[PDB]
């Protein structure tokens, strides 16, 4: 029980799943959800539809703390990043800003073979 | 580095006549200058190989000029080696 | 003997007694290394592009000086010893390169 009513929504999108955390203006999470939070199990988590009902699930859970206004941050590039912002768009939460914070390094670390051909 | 004052000094020193910047003596002098500088730089920084190549080249130049001088005028040669203290 | 430029970013929270303290410390450190000041421009507290030492702003002073080359590095080191000092940037002075001339 908080009565937050304003806050942040972090969409973390991968190729294997999409996951939405909804937090308070200071960044501490209020609730969250994901592909497997809802029924989904395998690859089907990284469905864009899954990301839809994940974002919606999170939104509904967030209305429970009585939230209205939310700034979005989107980290990651994957199937259903966009559809997660699109579900969130009118989830009943009204969306203030959208941002892309997706982390990229300056070539610090050596990626896995799968992710290689780069550095 | 090597400042212009240092250079002009050694040139004024080993010139054959005033105005000579080019004679074999002057050249061998300036070379000995740069060579000694580099030997000092390479006493430290022993791991710097490309500079070393440079110095190999400089040395080769010098031994060549000196060999010319000896072929030409042995007296000036003797004078030079004795003056800079070369031949090792 | 060459012309460099000393860049000093300072902590903005500074009291004047402590600020002037840091400045005269810089002075003594400059003199002690055989540097002579040519021009000085103290720009002051400006908003940075990203936190430095967790602080959102910084106090800038700039010194165009002529000093013996061999000592410069040592000097930089002295300059960084103080906690109130955040960045020290010492650049070899250059001639301004223009565009649209």
């Amino acid at each position: 029980k908080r009565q937050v009513a304003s806050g942040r929504a972090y969409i973390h999108a991968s190729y294997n799943n999409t996951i939405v955390t909804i937090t308070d203006p200071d960044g501490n999470p209020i609730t969250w959800s994901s592909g497997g939070v809802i029924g989904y199990k395998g690859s089907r988590k990284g469905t864009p539809y899954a990301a839809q009902l994940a974002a919606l699930d999170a939104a509904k859970k967030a209305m429970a703390y009585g939230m209205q206004s939310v700034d979005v941050i989107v980290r990651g590039t994957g199937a259903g990043r966009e559809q997660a912002i699109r579900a969130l768009q009118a989830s009943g939460l009204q969306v203030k800003s959208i941002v892309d914070d997706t982390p990229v390094p300056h070539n610090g670390c050596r990626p896995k073979k799968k992710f290689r051909k780069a550095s | 580095p090597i400042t212009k004052e240092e250079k002009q000094k050694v040139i004024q020193e080993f010139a054959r006549f005033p105005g000579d910047t080019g004679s074999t003596e002057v050249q061998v002098a300036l070379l000995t200058l740069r060579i000694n500088r580099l030997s000092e730089h390479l006493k430290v920084h022993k791991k710097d190989h490309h500079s070393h190549r440079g110095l190999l080249m400089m040395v080769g130049q010098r031994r060549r000029l000196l060999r010319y001088l000896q072929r030409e005028d042995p007296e000036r040669y003797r004078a030079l080696i004795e003056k800079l203290g070369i031949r090792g | 003997m060459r012309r460099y430029e000393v860049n000093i970013v300072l902590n903005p929270n500074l009291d004047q007694s402590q600020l002037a303290l840091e400045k005269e410390i810089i002075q003594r450190a400059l003199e002690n290394y055989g540097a002579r000041v040519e021009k000085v421009e103290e720009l002051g507290l400006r908003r940075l592009a990203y936190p430095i030492a967790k602080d959102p702003q910084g106090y800038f002073l700039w010194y165009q000086v002529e000093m013996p080359e061999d000592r410069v590095n040592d000097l930089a080191r002295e300059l960084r010893i103080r906690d109130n000092v955040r960045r020290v940037m010492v650049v070899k002075s250059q001639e301004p390169f223009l565009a649209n001339a």
Partner: protein, 73 residues
């Protein structure tokens, strides 16, 4: 494409070696932190190459961003 506006063409006569000048250097950066490519900076070989150094300098002094968050999307 990048036929829209060239940066040097939309600006005046400025010093390219000045890392202290902020508001000028700022216009050679992008939406995020990233230094703009030649085609959008309208600079030349040498010019670009020098801007890079002065910008990176300014970045170390904390006067220019290394990287920014992207808005909209």
């Amino acid at each position: 494409p990048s036929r829209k506006a060239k940066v040097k063409a939309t600006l005046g006569e400025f010093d390219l070696r000045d890392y202290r000048n902020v508001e000028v250097l700022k216009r050679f950066l992008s939406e995020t932190g990233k230094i703009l490519p030649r085609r959008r900076t309208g600079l030349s070989a040498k010019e670009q190459r020098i801007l890079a150094k002065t910008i990176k300098r300014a970045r170390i002094l904390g006067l220019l961003p290394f990287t920014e968050k992207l808005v909209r999307k």
